[PDB]
């Protein structure tokens, strides 16, 4: 019986815009779209 999975903490800014200031600025124009993603992954880790 499986009990857990590998816990992941994928990060928006680095994953989508590798250390690029203009890319991060234009990502900020998408609002709190991906803070949801970080929250969901944290929830997955805690649940595991």
């Amino acid at each position: 019986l499986p009990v857990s999975m590998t816990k992941t903490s994928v990060d928006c800014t680095m994953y989508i815009c590798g250390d690029s200031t203009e890319c991060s600025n234009l990502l900020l124009q998408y609002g709190s779209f991906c803070t949801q993603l970080k929250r969901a992954l944290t929830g997955i880790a805690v649940e595991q």
Binding site: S9, D11, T13, M14, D19, K38, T42
Partner: protein
């Protein structure tokens, strides 16, 4: 951008941080200097 506690409270936007651990940001070492090295040629192009 003051103390770890300051960054934590700022992350959850609340003056009261309950006991726990909170993932707030990421850390990267900014570069010191920068080696740019191209090929070993010098001859000028004939755009003239």
């Amino acid at each position: 951008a003051l103390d770890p506690l300051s960054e934590t409270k700022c992350t959850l936007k609340s003056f009261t941080v309950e006991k726990g651990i909170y993932q707030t940001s990421n850390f990267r070492v900014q570069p010191t200097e920068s080696i740019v090295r191209f090929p070993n040629v010098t001859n000028l192009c004939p755009f003239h």
